[PDB]
């Protein structure tokens, strides 16, 4: 059919350190800033809640949100070319070759994803400047040589039940089933493809399949990251539990579980979205395979 939503594309900086998603808050680091919002909620000697949230965190979210919107024009240009290359009936209403329309898709796609990074470069530098402010805000803790780890382990236990809400095993079952169907569908198109008849339906299948592989590749990335941070903090839930540490150690404690938890929430957003994107692509491939096998009396490939 038609891909009505191309939210599955992402991009990262050249250092591969910051990952931009089209879903809010576009950066996992924003989820970590919200966790410090909850970390200071339990440390009563910190009343800088309004300063970090209103003056910094929420305005970075809006600037990233605005930067994503600047690329909406390039976003729809890419979708328009996807709907032509995946749809033989639509491709037949236009006049240019399949290789010509295919090259435009490659150019427009790189222009779109590149827009997601270029418009967000100044927002990414703001992330490192905020990271330092949470360390400074945690330095205002009244304690120093002995800092209770009560809140740090209270947050860990709350994180364990938040992980239960996510269906990891079914997500694992899902990606293994569709990846297996994807590979066998790709290998079969290799064998059945020929060049004596009109190759427009084989072309649309291969095009959709290549996007299927990209979605599968991204799904496995997030599923692995989610599993990592889950196993890590449950290990900390079973890992050594001092009733007190020095304020420098408690700072990296909050930064450890805060990073782990923010990757979880970021993965949950992306995995729920990539799940629908892959399902929609698979249904298009099967609609295309029906066209390929719909006129057995005439020809196939």
């Amino acid at each position, epitope marked *: 059919n038609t891909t009505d939503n191309i939210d599955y594309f992402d991009i990262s900086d050249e250092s591969n350190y910051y990952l931009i998603s089209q879903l809010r808050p576009h950066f996992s680091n924003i989820y970590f800033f919200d966790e410090f919002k909850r970390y200071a909620s339990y440390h009563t000697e910190i009343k800088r809640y309004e300063d970090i949230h209103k003056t910094k965190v929420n305005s970075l979210l809006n600037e990233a949100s605005r930067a994503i919107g600047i690329c909406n024009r390039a976003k729809n240009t890419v979708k328009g070319l996807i709907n032509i290359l995946e749809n033989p009936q639509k491709f037949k209403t236009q006049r240019e070759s399949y290789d010509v329309k295919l090259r435009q898709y490659e150019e427009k796609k790189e222009a779109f994803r590149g827009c997601l990074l270029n418009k967000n470069r100044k927002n990414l530098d703001q992330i490192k400047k905020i990271n330092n402010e949470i360390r400074d805000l945690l330095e205002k803790l009244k304690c120093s040589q002995d800092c209770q780890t009560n809140v740090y382990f209270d947050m860990i236990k709350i994180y364990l039940v938040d992980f239960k809400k996510m269906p990891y095993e079914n997500y694992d079952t899902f990606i293994k089933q569709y990846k297996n169907s994807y590979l066998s569908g*790709v290998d079969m198109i290799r064998k059945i493809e020929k060049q004596i008849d009109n190759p427009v339906t084989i072309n649309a299948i291969k095009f959709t399949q290549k996007e299927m592989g990209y979605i599968i590749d991204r799904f496995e990335y997030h599923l692995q990251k989610v599993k990592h941070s889950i196993d890590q903090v449950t290990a900390l839930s079973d890992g050594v539990k001092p009733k007190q540490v020095t304020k420098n150690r408690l700072k990296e404690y909050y930064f450890n579980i805060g990073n782990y938890y923010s990757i979880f929430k970021f993965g949950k957003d992306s995995l729920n979205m990539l799940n629908k994107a892959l399902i929609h692509k698979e249904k298009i491939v099967h609609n295309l395979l029906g066209e390929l096998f719909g006129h057995l009396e005439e020809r196939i490939s």
Partner: antibody
Amino acid sequence: EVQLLESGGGLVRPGGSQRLSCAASGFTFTPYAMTWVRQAPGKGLEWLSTISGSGGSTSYADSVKGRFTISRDNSKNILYLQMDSLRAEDTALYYCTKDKDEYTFGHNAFDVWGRGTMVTVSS
Amino acid sequence: YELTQAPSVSVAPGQTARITCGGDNIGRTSVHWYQQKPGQAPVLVIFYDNDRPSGIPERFSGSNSGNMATLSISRVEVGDEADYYCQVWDSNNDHPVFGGGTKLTVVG
């Protein structure tokens, strides 16, 4: 133009460790699945491990499963193979190779190969 | 999955060499062929049963059907002396697998 260059293999004791690397150049390294293949002297090709483009999936052969670890750095175009608990039978020329296309997870032909690095496990 | 290859094949110059790749219903999956000359890396010579990379001589052709895949080299030159490996995807264990290899020796 597309190049793969293995490095890091040398003499190593039984039970020791050794890290192999493969430096890629000339193509978009991230969307491709990368694979390690070793070849004992005078023997045949043996598939060892494959890793997805993003690193979300990894597979191993039983002969090295539990001892070897494949990984990649998509910012520097480098494929890695960390070999622990090396045994004498691991003596081989270790090849770097690449899927012909993107997003095929090793279910493809291997069009570009490096020239390999010699790993010699001996006491 | 296991791939069966004969250890050796002998041909005369100008003849047609044939190297076999056996496997249970191997015709369901793609077979790839690699040429390895001594002291060199493998070179992809035939992929997807019968597709030929640009730069490989037309003397290299491929066929895969039933339980037998075959790589055939026509008008064999002395420079064709190498080891030839076939490879398929193991659909039960989900990983690539290589045959034992076949050494081609050009006689005469």
